């Protein structure tokens, strides 16, 4: 009867984007089209990411400029993580599960494949649950802020601190063993921190492909976000929030 009264996590559970497909089984397996498809697929997921974002309780109350900044700051974190989680669940941290119709064995993407597979195995190692994953993924949306601060900053930190407690409750709803909980919080939030370092190695490759491009097809949504962030990343206007400072 009071299972009717929804928690914040059951809410996060029902707004998770639906699976998307590369549209991919012409047939030859070339660099250009695989990269191009991944570009096109990353567009749709960023697009997904936004609808998702705009459903996260608290994300609404923040300023529109505050909403844009966070998505342009976190978009690569959300994909890196999501990919990890899927590769974790579909193939025990061993394969790179972009979509059902696109399962990439190692093979270019060395730095990428390595770093991406790390995330996945860490999820596999910790054996993260779905509620855990949901809270953790929302936290990644709130992973970085402008150094000059968000307009709705005071509000931002209120909401972010709320979603930590939720990842807390996810651990508690999982078991509540002992100091086992403490240790789990430690290891989970540590993983979130490593995300900062992983996304950087992924964000550069992405720029290098975007700029050094030679020819390669890119969607509107990514192009903008990319072109718009390069000067933000380049000038140091970003402040990476970490759990273990």
């Amino acid at each position: 009867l009071p299972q009717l009264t929804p928690t914040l996590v059951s809410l996060l559970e029902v707004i998770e984007p639906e699976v998307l497909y590369a549209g991919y089984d012409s047939v030859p397996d070339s660099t250009w089209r695989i990269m191009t498809t991944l570009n096109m697929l990353g567009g749709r997921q960023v697009i997904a990411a936004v609808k998702w974002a705009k459903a996260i309780p608290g994300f609404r109350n923040l300023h529109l400029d505050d909403q844009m900044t966070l998505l342009q700051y976190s978009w690569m974190y959300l994909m890196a993580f999501a990919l990890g989680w899927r590769s974790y669940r579909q193939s025990s941290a061993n394969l790179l599960c972009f979509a059902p119709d696109l399962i990439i064995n190692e093979q270019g993407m060395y730095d990428q494949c390595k770093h991406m597979l790390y995330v996945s195995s860490e999820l596999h190692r910790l054996q993260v649950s779905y509620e855990e994953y949901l809270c953790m993924k929302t936290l990644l949306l709130l992973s970085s802020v402008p150094k000059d601060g968000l307009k709705s900053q005071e509000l931002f930190d209120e909401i972010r601190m709320t979603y930590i407690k939720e990842l807390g409750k996810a651990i508690v709803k999982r078991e509540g063993n002992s100091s086992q909980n403490w240790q789990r919080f430690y290891q989970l939030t540590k993983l979130l921190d490593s995300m900062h370092e992983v996304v950087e190695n992924l964000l550069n490759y992405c720029f290098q492909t975007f700029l050094d491009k030679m020819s390669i097809e890119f969607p509107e949504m990514l192009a903008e976000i990319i072109t718009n962030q390069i000067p933000k990343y380049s000038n140091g206007n970003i402040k990476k929030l970490l759990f273990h400072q």
């Binding site: 697009i47 529109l64 844009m68 509107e220 949504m221 903008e224």
Partner: peptide, 9 residues
């Protein structure tokens, strides 16, 4: 702008 419109839907 592209992102902007999408957030303002």
């Amino acid at each position: 702008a592209l992102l902007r419109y999408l957030l303002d839907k």
